[PDB]
Amino acid sequence: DIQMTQSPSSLSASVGDRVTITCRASQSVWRNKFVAWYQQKPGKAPKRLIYAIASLYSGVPSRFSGSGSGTDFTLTISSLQPEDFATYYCVGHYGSENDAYYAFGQGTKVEIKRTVAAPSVFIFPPSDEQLKSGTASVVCLLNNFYPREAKVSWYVDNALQSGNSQESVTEQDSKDSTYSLSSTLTLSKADYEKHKVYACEVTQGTTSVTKSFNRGE
Amino acid sequence: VQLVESGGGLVQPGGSLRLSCTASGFSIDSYGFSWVRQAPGKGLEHIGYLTAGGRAFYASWAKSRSTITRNTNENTVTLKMNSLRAEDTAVYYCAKLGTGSRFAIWGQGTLVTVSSASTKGPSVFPLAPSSKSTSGGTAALGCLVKDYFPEPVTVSWNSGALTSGVHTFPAVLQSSGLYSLSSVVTVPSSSLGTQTYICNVNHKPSNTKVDKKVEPK
C-alpha cells in the first residue's frame, strides 16, 4: 500500500491570497516523481491539475504550481480566486517490479474568506397536497450567509425539537461567496395538525433569528 | 480516446457489483488502469490497479472483496466487489490517473447504490411564496422534491430561463431509504402576481419528469 496525508484538511483565504497545501506520502513515490494534484469543483468529476510533481497540464491556470520530492509535496495557489473553491487531492503512486499502488490524500477543502453575512430566513408550511400523503415537511431556508456555520433549532408550540430534522448546505456561491442552508422538519400529519405554532431559530454569532407561522392562517 | 463505465445501478445489501470499463481509440492492454470511487460526502478512494501487463494490485481495504480483470476481446477492464455495504454506495470511475505521465484519462463514472429500496420517482411539493416568505421586495419560493430513489434528480426553473437566485440543495437520505431535496429561488415580490414559476424536476432512473407550478399562498 501507499497513503497520502494532506495538510491542512480545510482552509479559508481571501481573494488574492497565497495558499499552500502539503502532502506526505507513506512511501517513496515511483521514480521519486509520480505524484499528481487533482481538483474537484462542486458537482464535477475530478480534474488533474499537475502531474509528475510540477508539470502543469495544458489549460490549467498558471497560479497552480507543485513542488517537492521523495515523500513531501506541496501545491501552491499563488492568488486564490473564487473559482478555486474545490477539494484538492494529491495522488501518489508506489511502484516496484512487484508493486503498483495508488492513493489519494484525504482532500483539502478551500473556500473564499469574506465578511460575515447574516442569512435571510424563510419558513414554509407543508402544502395541503403533501398532508394528504400522511406526512408534513416544514422547510426553513437560510439564504446567502457567511461563514458556513449556523445553528438551526426547530420549535413546535415552543417545544424544542430533536431528531426529526435534516439539513443540507450549498457550495460556496461563485459570485457573492455566501452559502445557503435548508432545514427540513418532518412530522406525521397527525402531529402537525395537533400543534399550532411552528418556528425555526437560526443562530449566527450573537444573533438568533426566529421565523414562525401559525398553522392554517 | 474515451473510457466508458457500464454496469452501474442498484445492488441489494450484501450483493455484488459488476462494472465494466470500455476503451475507445486504443487497446485496453496498452496501459494500466485504476478503479476509483467516491462515496457521497467523502474523498476519492483508490480501489485497485491492473498493470499494462495484466497483473492486478488491490488497495488493502479492497483486496478481500474485489476482483479486477481484463477482456482484450471486448477491450474492457472489469471490477467485481461482493458483500456490498451501505458505505459502498458511490460513483465508480475507471481511470489512468497520470501521476507521472502526461497521459491521463477518466471515464465519466457510474453510480452504484447499495440499498434495499426500489426505484421511485419523486413527489414534488410546492414551497409557496406568501406574506411570510416575503421580506422587503424579495420573495422566496421553491419545490420540495421528496421520496425518490436512486440519485440523482436535476432541477431547473421555468425551463432554464430563471437561474439567478436559484439554490438546489444536496439530496439527503431519509430514514425510509428514499432521497429528498429542496430547490429554492428568490424573486422580486412584485412579480408574484404576474410571473409564473415552474420547477422542472427530472429523475432519469425512473424516466420521470415533474413540472410543478408554484403558486402564491
Among A46, A141, A211, select the one facing B184 at the smallest CB separation.
A141
Q: How far from A1 is each of A13, A96, A184, B61, B66, CA to CA, in Å?
A: 34, 12, 42, 10, 15
Chain B residue numbers touching A167 (CB-CB < 8 A): 172
Contact at 8 Å (CB) between A40 and A83? no
* B187 and B159 together in one domain: yes
**Total of domains in chain A:** 2
* Domain final residue pick, B74, B93, B114: B114
Contact at 8 Å (CB) between A108 and A8? yes
* B105 and B184 together in one domain: no
Q: Tell whether A91 lies on the interface with B, counting CB pairs under 8 A.
A: yes
* Domain final residue pick, B76, B95, B114: B114
Chain A nearest C-alpha distance from B74 (Å) = 24
Hey, what's the cell of B128? 409557496
Q: Among candidates B102, B21, B35, which has minimal Cα distance to B63?
A: B35
Burial string for B79-91 (b: 16+ CB within 10 Å, else e) reads: bebeebeeebbbb
Angstrom distance (rounded) from CA B74 to CA B49: 19
Grid look-up 447574516 returns A118
Find the residue in B nearest to A213 (Cα). Answer: B132
* B107 and B137 together in one domain: no
Q: Within a 10 A sphere around the Cβ of A96, how many other Cβ atoms?
A: 9
Burial (CB count <10 Å: 0-12, 13-18, 19+), residue B115: middle
* B103 and B141 together in one domain: no
* B104 and B127 together in one domain: no
Angstrom distance (rounded) from CA A187 to CA A164: 7
List the single best residue of A122, A179, A211 to mutate versus B (max B Cβ within 10 A). A122
Q: Among candidates A112, A126, A180, which has minimal Cα distance to A152?
A: A180
* A83 and A158 together in one domain: no
Length of chain B: 217
Q: Within a 10 A sphere around the Cβ of A14, how many other Cβ atoms?
A: 10
Find the CATH number of the domain harbouring B84.
Answer: 2.60.40.10
* A150 and A181 together in one domain: yes
Long-range contacts of B78-82 (CB under 8 A, 24+ apart): B78/B18, B78/B19, B78/B20, B78/B21, B79/B17, B79/B18, B79/B19, B79/B21, B79/B35, B79/B47, B79/B48, B80/B16, B80/B17, B80/B18, B80/B19, B81/B16, B81/B17, B81/B47, B82/B15, B82/B16
Interface of A with B in 184-213 (CB under 8 A): 184, 186, 211, 213
Give the list of residues 6+ apart from residue B10 with CB closer than 8 angstroms, or none. B113, B115, B118, B119, B150
* A85 and A159 together in one domain: no
Peptide bond into B205 cis (omega under 30): no
Chain A residue numbers touching B182 (CB-CB < 8 A): 139, 141, 168, 182, 184
Q: How far from B57 is each of A28, A189, B50, B73, CA to CA, in Å?
A: 18, 54, 6, 22
Chain B residue numbers touching A6 (CB-CB < 8 A): none
Among B45, B142, B172, select the one facing A168 at the smallest CB separation.
B172
Q: Among candidates A95, A82, A84, which has minimal Cα distance to A37?
A: A84
Chain A nearest C-alpha distance from B181 (Å) = 8
CB contact under 8 A, B98 and A55: no
| Domain hosting residue B157, numbered range | 123-213
* A26 and A80 together in one domain: yes
Length of chain A: 217
* Domain final residue pick, A73, A92, A112: A112
Burial (CB count <10 Å: 0-12, 13-18, 19+), residue A10: exposed
| Domain hosting residue A86, numbered range | 4-112
* A100 and A38 together in one domain: yes
* A102 and A20 together in one domain: yes
Q: Tell whether A40 lies on the interface with B, counting CB pairs under 8 A.
A: yes
Find the residue in A nearest to B173 (Cα). Answer: A166
Angstrom distance (rounded) from CA A94 to CA A101: 5
Give the list of residues 6+ apart from residue B41 with CB closer than 8 angstroms, or none. none
Angstrom distance (rounded) from CA B79 to CA B111: 14
Hey, what's the cell of B178? 428514499
Chain B residue numbers touching A31 (CB-CB < 8 A): 100
Beta bridge partners of B187: B139
Helices then strands, each counted (H, E), chain B: 1, 20
Beta bridge partners of B125: B144
Could you give the 3-state DSSP secondary structure of residue B87?
A: helix
Angstrom distance (rounded) from CA B30 to CA B107: 17
CB contact under 8 A, A184 and B180: yes
Chain A nearest C-alpha distance from B95 (Å) = 11
Chain B nearest C-alpha distance from A87 (Å) = 8
Contact at 8 Å (CB) between A110 and A85? yes
CB contact under 8 A, A137 and B125: yes
Among A99, A100, A137, select the one facing B144 at the smallest CB separation.
A137
* A130 and A195 together in one domain: yes
Hey, what's the cell of B109? 463514472
Q: Within a 10 A sphere around the Cβ of B69, how many other Cβ atoms?
A: 12
Contact at 8 Å (CB) between A46 and A104? no
Residue type, A58: S
CB contact under 8 A, B44 and A38: yes
* Domain final residue pick, A52, A85, A112: A112
CB contact under 8 A, B144 and A139: yes
Find the CATH number of the domain harbouring A37.
Answer: 2.60.40.10
Dihedral-angle region of residue B193 (phi above 0 means left; psi in -120 to 50 means alpha; beta otherwise): alpha
3-state secondary structure chain A: CCCEEEECCEEEECCCCCEEEEEEECCCCHHHCCEEEEEECCCCCCEEEEECCCEECCCCCCCEEEEEECCEEEEEECCCCHHHCEEEEEEEEEEECCEEEEEECCCEEEEECCCCECCEEEEECCCHHHHCCCEEEEEEEEEEEECCCCEEEEEECCEECCCCEEEEECCCCCCCCCEEEEEEEEEEHHHHHHCCEEEEEEEECCEEEEEEEECCC
Hey, what's the cell of A177? 461567496
* B85 and B18 together in one domain: yes
* A66 and A124 together in one domain: no
Find the residue in B nearest to A6 (Cα). Answer: B43
Contact at 8 Å (CB) between B38 and B44? yes
Q: Where are the alpha helices (DSSP H) in B13-165?
A: 60-63
Contact at 8 Å (CB) between A141 and B128? no
* B40 and B66 together in one domain: yes
* Domain final residue pick, A91, A112, A133: A112
DSSP conformation class of B159: G
* A47 and A145 together in one domain: no
Q: Kindly list the strands in the beta sheet with A120-124, ordered across the sheet, starting from the edge strand earlier in the chain.
A: A120-124, A135-145, A179-188, A165-169
* Domain final residue pick, B114, B149, B164: B114
Angstrom distance (rounded) from CA B8 to CA A18: 41
Cα B132–Cα B136–Cα B137 angle in degrees, nearest 5: 100
Q: Cα(first)–Cα(last) distance of chain A, in Å?
A: 63
Q: Within a 10 A sphere around the Cβ of B55, how many other Cβ atoms?
A: 12
* A108 and A196 together in one domain: no
Residue type, B8: G
Chain B residue numbers touching A106 (CB-CB < 8 A): 43
Chain B residue numbers touching A60 (CB-CB < 8 A): none
* A13 and A108 together in one domain: yes
* B85 and B168 together in one domain: no
Q: Within a 10 A sphere around the Cβ of B111, how many other Cβ atoms?
A: 17
Contact at 8 Å (CB) between B190 and B173? no
CB contact under 8 A, B98 and A129: no
Find the residue in A nearest to B46 (Cα). Answer: A103
Could you give the 3-state DSSP secondary structure of residue B13?
A: coil
Angstrom distance (rounded) from CA B146 to CA B121: 9
Strands B110-114 and B9-11: parallel
Hey, what's the cell of A197? 405554532
* B98 and B159 together in one domain: no
* A18 and A97 together in one domain: yes
Contact at 8 Å (CB) between A4 and A28? no
Residue type, B15: G
Find the residue in B nearest to A138 (Cα). Answer: B127
**Total of domains in chain B:** 2
* B107 and B138 together in one domain: no
Chain A nearest C-alpha distance from B174 (Å) = 8
